[PDB]
Amino acid sequence: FNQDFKITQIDENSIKYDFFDKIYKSKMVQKRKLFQFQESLIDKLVSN
Amino acid sequence: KELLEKDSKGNIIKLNEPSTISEDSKVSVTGLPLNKGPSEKIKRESLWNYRKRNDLKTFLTENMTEESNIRSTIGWNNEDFCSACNQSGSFLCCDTCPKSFHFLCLDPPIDPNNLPKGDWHCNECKFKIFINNSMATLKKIESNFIKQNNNVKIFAKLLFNIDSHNPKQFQLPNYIKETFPAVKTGSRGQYSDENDKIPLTDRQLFNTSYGQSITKLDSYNPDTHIDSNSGKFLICYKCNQTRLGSWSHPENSRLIMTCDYCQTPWHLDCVPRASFKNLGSKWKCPLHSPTKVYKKIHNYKVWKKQRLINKKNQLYYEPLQKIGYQNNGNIQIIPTTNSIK
Amino acid sequence: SQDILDLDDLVEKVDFYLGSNKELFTWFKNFVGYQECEAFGPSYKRLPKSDTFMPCSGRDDMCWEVLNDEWVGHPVWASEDSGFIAHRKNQYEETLFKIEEERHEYDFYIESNLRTIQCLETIVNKIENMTENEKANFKLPPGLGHTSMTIYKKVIRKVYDKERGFEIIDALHEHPAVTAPVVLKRLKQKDEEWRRAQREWNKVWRELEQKVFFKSLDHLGLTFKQADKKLLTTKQLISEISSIKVDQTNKKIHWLTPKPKSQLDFDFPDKNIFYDILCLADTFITHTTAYSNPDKERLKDLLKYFISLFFSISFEKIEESL
Amino acid sequence: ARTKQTARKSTGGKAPRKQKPHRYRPGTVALREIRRYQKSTELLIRKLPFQRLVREIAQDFKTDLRFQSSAVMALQEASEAYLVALFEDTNLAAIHAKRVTIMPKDIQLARRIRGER
Amino acid sequence: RDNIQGITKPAIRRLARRGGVKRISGLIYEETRGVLKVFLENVIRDAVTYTEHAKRKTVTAMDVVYALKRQGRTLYGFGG
Amino acid sequence: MVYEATPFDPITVKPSDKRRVAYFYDADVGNYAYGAGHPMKPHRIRMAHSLIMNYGLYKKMEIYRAKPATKQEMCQFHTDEYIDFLSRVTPDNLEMFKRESVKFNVGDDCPVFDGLYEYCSISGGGSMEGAARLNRGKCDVAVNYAGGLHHAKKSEASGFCYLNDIVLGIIELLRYHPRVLYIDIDVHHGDGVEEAFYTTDRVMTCSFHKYGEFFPGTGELRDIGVGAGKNYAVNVPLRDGIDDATYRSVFEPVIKKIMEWYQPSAVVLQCGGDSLSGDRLGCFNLSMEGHANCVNYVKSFGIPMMVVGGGGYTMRNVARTWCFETGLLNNVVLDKDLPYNEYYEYYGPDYKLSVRPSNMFNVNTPEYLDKVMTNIFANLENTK
Amino acid sequence: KISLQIPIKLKSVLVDDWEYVTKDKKICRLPADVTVEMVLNKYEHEVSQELESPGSQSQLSEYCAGLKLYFDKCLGNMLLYRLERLQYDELLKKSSKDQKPLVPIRIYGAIHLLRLISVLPELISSTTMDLQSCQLLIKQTEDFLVWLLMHVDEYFNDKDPNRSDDALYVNTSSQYEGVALGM
Amino acid sequence: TIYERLLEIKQMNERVTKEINTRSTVTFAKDLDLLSSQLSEMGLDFVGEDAYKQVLRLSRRLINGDLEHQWFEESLR
Ligand SMILES: [Zn+2]
Ligand SMILES: [Zn+2]
Ligand SMILES: [Zn+2]
Ligand SMILES: [Zn+2]
Ligand SMILES: [Zn+2]
């Protein structure tokens, strides 16, 4: 089955877009989860 | 030859010395026996010219040595190659057959201390004696084995014929190897691929001059910073310099090697390395993308790049989706053809 | 970008890619958001738990705790089934090793024989001072009461015959009363003959060592003449200055805006060395025959004039110093 | 059970240790080069191999024997002269038996009839 | 020893070619090398015997053609 | 900014660091010989010892003959089958053990001589008794040149080494000391000792070795230990021809950082003489001063140490450097004029104590050693 | 001439097996967490309900049983490299210790079954088998091979032995190497 | 090149001169004549003279052809 080892023909601009997209995703998911944990800890300290 | 001349009552009287001259003149490392000194033929070039106190303190040790047993654990606490793998070694030789097999290569493997007492025949030879002893011909036994093993019919001819085949080491067939052009076969049948150097002959390792060594560490060699086919200077990638030296200060010369894949020249200090990678696997510069990586799950996950496939069975396809296309990491870069900027 | 490579290895790869560009690799270092285990190494692999379970009878709990039995390494694995490169040695070093080998052969054999002579003469002076009625049943244990059990066996198996050495050892163990003095006498004769041969060989070894040793310790000097013929040429001297200029121009575009106006720097702290080179050149001019006498004298004042004009040395100082 | 040892090594891994183009027919070129080696006058055994031959073969008769440069050249020439005569005799005893190809048995008879076997 | 195979197969063909031989068996070469050595030890045994007669420790082209003279064959231009 | 190019200072003893020195020598060790063409010679031990006696060094130290190890004391590190094979194999019955010959790597490059078991027993007993005397406080420095077999492993013999006595000595040290530092200045990597203590933090194995295509191939800088022994196996890869100043400026900062970071209770120092210049197999350019400066520097820390002599395949140089190192442990510097010994004919042509370095290229550049020591110092930050 | 259409994923799995055994000097974990019977039984239990033809069911059970018998009789002969023959020897001695004969069905993993499939056409061409049986056996082997692609992530996984004890391959010892490739 | 080669010799000339002049041979080698007899008969050792000046004289003799290359190298080494 020759279709299993198909080599993807990608370009430089698509790699640039994908790298930028994924670093922005990673940076803001860790930033937003840090913000959510900070808000949760603030609520925990307020309730306690 | 009557070493101890015992008496009539068995008492010892006198023994006779054996043949000292039997090995009194054995050749030592000097080329002469220890009985004699050097000959004149070797005294001519050894000596500079040839014409035709006992105050030792080393005998006091035995006395000044005190035994030591204070540890906590004191007291108690036929051919020259195998017919199966085509490699040399210790063989078990077939008697009525010119083939030789390794002790571990047979079925079942034979212990090198529990050998067969009288004769040993190979599987092919044993099948030959079994056929010649039986009055019926080979196809009659094949048909009888097919008819008796009525449970399986299609594999019955496969089951019958491998009792006659001698055991052999498994080798991948050619059509599994030809689909990967980078994959080669070594001299012993071992694996070999593009990440393997061409083995250096003994003419290069031990048949070279004293100052010039494959290691390139015993002398100042400035004909390594200069490209052979261009004549320019091999600029190291990290330091952006070529430290050729000056032959008046050869300690100012930094060793440089080239990558075995992209020929990118690297200093021996910019990438931390002490060897030149003369034999073994091909040296890979740090700039190449890995073919195997491990990532943490946070177990783990591994990824290996697909092996190279010959052009008749390798399909290169161009994605329609440009952004976010989950490729397996196995990609190819195409050239980029003002609005996009 | 395919969620395959980890951020740490990506930062390492970019560090290997844009290391010298400090400003760029910092943009990325942070544009990315990297904040500063299981490093096994290349030369160790882990055995399964089946191969670990092998009986070591002397091990207690501490030995089983502090000793590694799962991670192993071998020279064949580290060689990638290729081999090793031995260090190249001079032929003078090889013959020095041969001299040492012969020395070791003689001294090993002589000292083993001397130790056996000492043990046998202890046995002999023990057996001399007792009468004969119990000398018949007197036996000797393996090792002859010595800390070794094999050294006397080696000496006997060498001095006597191969097949007769075992039976002489057994006769010494069973009946040492007759076998001990003859064995001691033969060993002493072999000792003195080996020592005379060793002294006569020691003369030869010492003279070859004196002939060989300093050339053997010379590495770069043994090949300095061909190296100086090959490397003190026009091409290599052009290559050195051109390589330094290429380095300077390559590093000029990155930093060091005041680009230097020089490539090679030569220091001349001593002035008498100029007179020494002038004397050596004058000696070569006087000795040589391929140059005519007018060409010889023009060479002389050309060298003197260039040295007096290039440097601060005067012609009067050159004439009074040479 | 007969056994034999071939590895000849007590231990393995000894290395990792501390110690369209024209083609003339089969036969066509040969006569062109019969003439080349016949019109030529050089000596047909390479001097360095033959020199080394005379050195390695003379050593057993007398130790440290030196040869004048011309002495080995006299040997070189004498041997080629000896062999070209023997090979003419070979070709003659080969063409005797209705043949063009020679075989050693030709030259053992050629030596036997000349009286040195 | 090592130089007896130094008398190479094309060289033996060149001797045969100088000798007018068109086709040569494969078994010619090694026993022809043997015939060459028996001839060489004979001639050099005579030549060296002439050499230690002269209180000498080198053999000369003169001694070679002299041995050849005993053996019966004469060579010219090599002295004598 | 870690490596500093410093000229080799002269060796000076510390008079405030007097140590009780125990010497372990069995007169028999030398009567054993690996083979006819073999480089390893136990005869180097007794010409080293003959230099100790004739220098009058026995008046400042105690000479002991250690009890040879039995079968199951050797099995404190090795398997039962390997010690059983070693104790039974002879050059006579070599054909009776053909499977075990290739199993345990004995027969080629580790030949079978008929005093093999006794030689291994002497070596292991010397190492274990030196460690035991260090444990009970009977001595501060234990000297045993009979051992040093650092290449031997659990079930194999490699690198002319059969019984890994250094592992047995470190095992005996671990019964009384919590942290034992092993320093290997042999030109080959201490693969057996490092492999034995790879996964433990109780033993830090530091090896200063040539790492090229050289034996044993192990000893990459990235080899720092696994499991609990991570960053507890320091490997210092070196190139050919390292001189005394370069080796000192590499050795002293690394060992100093280990001393003030790992803080060991006992030190095992492998004094391989194949690190010397002019060795048959070694490729370094150390003089006897350069070899002995490591021993003198590790002596300055005051930690109870075990000086164990390893390689060295030119007998004269290794004997002279062992005599100088042994004299250095008694806070004296032996004069460079050899006394009359029975092996005086070896040390020509000057018949002095000094081992002269060769004039070969010190290709260990300061940048490479700076990077090596920077990564080593970075790995040592987690050993507090 | 007999040809087999093995997918290139399984071809690469076989080539990686060759790499691990000969170059990396790795043997298989025996017995595997998934044996060969276990694969020839799950494939039968998966494609048995895929169609309702009783003759096809008989042919499928015939092929599976014949493959099992062929695997047992041929594994000791020609299915494993020179390195793994020592492991085969120790398995045979361990089986003889407890007086149960060694059957490769319950011991060896699916990679050796893939080896048997890959070497199978040469065995087919070496016997007097008629064209119909060869064609149908090749067809059944091809169907088993394309069944293996749908489960290639659960039989042929990629795991470092240095990191995971549940890898399909194990690293070997120097003593195993010496006995396997030294005598 | 010549001046650097000679400057390496001259910059260490005083220490090598003090080392050669203060060369105290061991006693048992003098009593049993184990030292090298030559390099003193042909005047190749550097005892009693300045080392750099002796290097210059030896190199002048080597240039003039009255001194062999091997003996010059052996004396220098
Ligand atoms: Zn047979
Ligand atoms: Zn085999
Ligand atoms: Zn660089
Ligand atoms: Zn590269
Ligand atoms: Zn070593």
Q: F104: Cβ–Cβ under 8 A, 6 or more apart, which residues?
A: F82, F85, F86, F155, F156, F157, G175, G178
Cβ–Cβ gap C58/F75 under 8 Å = yes
Calculate how far, in angstroms, residue F363's C-alpha sits from the geometric centre of ligand 4.
23
Contact B225, B266 (CB under 8 A): no
Distances (CA, A) of B144 to B138, B147, C226, F127: 10, 5, 82, 71
Query: Quick count: other Cβ atoms within 10 Å of Cβ B229?
Result: 5
Cβ–Cβ gap H34/F350 under 8 Å = no
Cβ–Cβ gap A4/G7 under 8 Å = yes
Q: Smallest Cα–Cα separation from F198: which of B37, C73, A31?
A: C73
**DSSP per-residue string spanning C206-236:** HHHHHHHHHHHT-STTTTHHHHHHHHSSHHH
Can you count the helices (H) and strands (E) in chain E? 3, 1
Contact F369, F245 (CB under 8 A): no
Of the bound ligands, which one is closest to the alpha carbon of residue B264?
A: 4
Calculate how far, in angstroms, residue B101's C-alpha sits from the geometric centre of ligand 2.
6
Residue type at position G65: A
DSSP-H helix ranges across chain F? 43-54, 71-74, 80-88, 99-103, 116-135, 165-174, 191-196, 244-262, 288-299, 315-328, 366-379
Pairwise CA distance, residues F354 & F341, whole Å: 16
Distances (CA, A) of F117 to F108, F125, F132, F167, G128: 17, 12, 22, 17, 61
Using a threshold of 3 CB pairs under 8 A, tell whether chains G and H touch: no
**Residue D88: φ, ψ to 5°:** -65, -45
Q: Smallest Cα–Cα separation from E33: which of E64, E11, E65, E61?
A: E11
Q: Smallest Cα–Cα separation from B104: which of G97, G120, G92?
A: G92
Secondary structure in 3-state letters for chain B: CCCEEECCCCCEEEECCCCHHHCCCCCCCCCCCCCCCCCHHHHHHHCCCCCCCCCCCCCCHHHHEEEECCCCCCCCCCCCCCCCCCCCCEEEECCCCCCEEECCCCCCCCCCCCCCCCCCCCHHHHHHHHHHHCCCCHHHHHHHHHHHCCCCCCCHHHHHHCCCCCCCCCCCCHHHHCCCCCCEECCCCCEECCCCCCCCCHHHHCCCCCCCCCCCCCCCCCCCCECCCCCCECCCCCCCCCCCCCCCCHHHCCCEEECCCCCCEEECCCCCCCCCCCCCCCCCCCCCCCCEEEEECCCEEEEECCCCCCCCCCCEECCCCCCCCCCCCCEEEECCCCCCC
Q: Which positions in chain A touch B313 (Cβ < 8 Å)?
A: 2
Length of chain A: 48
Q: What is the DSSP letter of C144?
A: T
Pairwise CA distance, residues C50 & C73, whole Å: 17
Residue type at position G63: Y
What are the structure tokens assigned to F139, written together?
A: 């001595």
Using a threshold of 3 CB pairs under 8 A, tell whether chains H and C touch: yes
Cβ–Cβ gap B233/C242 under 8 Å = yes
Calculate how far, in angstroms, residue F206's C-alpha sits from the geometric centre of ligand 5.
14
H33 touches chain B (CB under 8 A): no
Query: Quick count: other Cβ atoms within 10 Å of Cβ B76?
Result: 8
Q: What is the DSSP letter of F286?
A: B
Residue type at position B309: I
Pairwise CA distance, residues C274 & B280, whole Å: 52
CA angle at residue F346 from F23 to C152, to 5 degrees?
Answer: 65
What are the structure tokens assigned to D26, written together?
A: 């089969």
Place of tokens 């260990």: F364
Q: Which positions in chain D touch G175 (Cβ < 8 Å)?
A: none
Pairwise CA distance, residues F234 & F223, whole Å: 7
CA B12 from chain centre, in angstroms, equals 59
Sign of CA dihedral C232, C234, C240, C241: positive
Interfacial B residues in 20-59 facing D (CB < 8 Å) = 41
Cβ–Cβ gap F160/D19 under 8 Å = yes
Query: Quick count: other Cβ atoms within 10 Å of Cβ B133?
Result: 7
CA-based nearest distance F142→chain D, Å: 28
The radius of gyration computed from the CA coordinates of chain C, to the nearest angstrom, equals 38
Q: Which positions in chain D touch B119 (Cβ < 8 Å)?
A: 1
Contact F100, F162 (CB under 8 A): no
Query: Quick count: other Cβ atoms within 10 Å of Cβ B63?
Result: 8
Of the bound ligands, which one is closest to the alpha carbon of residue B78?
A: 1
| Edge-to-edge strand ranges of the sheet holding F21-24 | B65-68, F62-66, F21-24, F141-144, F305-309, F266-271, F180-184, F203-210, F233-238
Place of tokens 């019984």: F163
Using a threshold of 3 CB pairs under 8 A, tell whether chains H and A touch: no
Q: On the CB side of H55, how many CA atoms lie within 13 Å of its CA?
A: 18
Domains of chain F, CATH where assigned: 21-384 (3.40.800.20)
Pairwise CA distance, residues B225 & B234, whole Å: 5
Contact F133, F296 (CB under 8 A): no
Domains of chain E, CATH where assigned: 1-78 (1.10.20.10)
Pairwise CA distance, residues F282 & F241, whole Å: 9
Cβ–Cβ gap C16/B287 under 8 Å = yes
Q: Which positions in chain C touch D17 (Cβ < 8 Å)?
A: 75, 84
> Is the omega angle on the peptide bond into residue F237 within 30 degrees of 0, that is, cis?
no
Domains of chain D, CATH where assigned: 20-117 (1.10.20.10)
Interface test with C, best of G26, G94, G162 (most C CBs within 10 A): G162
Q: On the CB side of C24, how many CA atoms lie within 13 Å of its CA?
A: 9
Of the bound ligands, which one is closest to the alpha carbon of residue F270?
A: 5
CA-based nearest distance H15→chain B, Å: 22
Is F63 in a helix, a strand, or coil?
strand
Length of chain F: 384
Q: Which positions in chain A touch G146 (Cβ < 8 Å)?
A: 1
Experimental approach was cryo-EM
Pairwise CA distance, residues D19 & D8, whole Å: 17
Domain that holds residue G68: 2-183
Q: Classify residue F17 by burial, with Cβ atoms within 10 Å: 0-12, 13-18, 19+.
A: middle
Contact F106, F112 (CB under 8 A): yes
Interface test with C, best of G83, G86, G87, G174 (most C CBs within 10 A): G174
Number of domains in chain G: 1
Residues of F carrying an active site annotation? 151
> Is the omega angle on the peptide bond into residue G31 within 30 degrees of 0, that is, cis?
yes
Hey, which chains touch B, using 3+ CB pairs under 8 Å? A, C, D, F, G, H
The conformational region for residue C81 under phi > 0 = left, psi -120 to 50 = alpha, else beta, is left
Q: Rounded to the nearest 10 degrees, how much is the dihedral formed by the CA atoms of H23, H27, H32, H36?
A: -10
This PDB structure is determined at a resolution in Å of 7.6
Pairwise CA distance, residues E18 & D87, whole Å: 9
Residue type at position C94: E
Length of chain G: 183
Query: Quick count: other Cβ atoms within 10 Å of Cβ A37?
Result: 10
> Is the omega angle on the peptide bond into residue C260 within 30 degrees of 0, that is, cis?
no
Q: Which positions in chain C touch G23 (Cβ < 8 Å)?
A: 81
CA angle at residue G57 from G52 to G59, to 5 degrees?
Answer: 140
Pairwise CA distance, residues F100 & F94, whole Å: 10
